[PDB]
């Protein structure tokens, strides 16, 4: 129950369609929440929206 | 812009450490720079009040 933390790059589409799955694998109680938001908004705001 | 000398070295120290080199998440342009983002800041506020 160590709770991790992602870091990525906005430029890289390809790191968020595979950050696409660890949200979906992974639950996001787990992930800190200055960077789970961070990376839930860079698929919003680049891949789906 | 604006940063002490020292920073400079202290931030030098550790950026082979911590590896943070796309976090500013910008498309580059030539003919962009900080100098002058600092400059139109000082002359739209200073041509205003004057």
């Known amino acids: ?49 | 812009l604006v940063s002490t000398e020292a920073q400079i070295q202290k931030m030098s120290q550790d950026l082979q450490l911590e590896a943070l080199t796309i976090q500013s998440e910008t498309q580059f342009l030539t003919g962009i720079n900080s100098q002058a983002a600092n400059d139109c800041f000082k002359t739209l506020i200073a041509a205003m009040l004057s």
């Open chain 1, 1 to 49: 129950q160590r709770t991790m933390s992602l870091d990525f790059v906005t430029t890289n589409y390809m790191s968020l369609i595979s950050g696409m799955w660890l949200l979906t694998v992974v639950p996001n109680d787990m992930f800190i929440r200055e960077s789970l938001v961070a990376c839930q908004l860079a698929i919003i705001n680049t891949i789906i929206y």
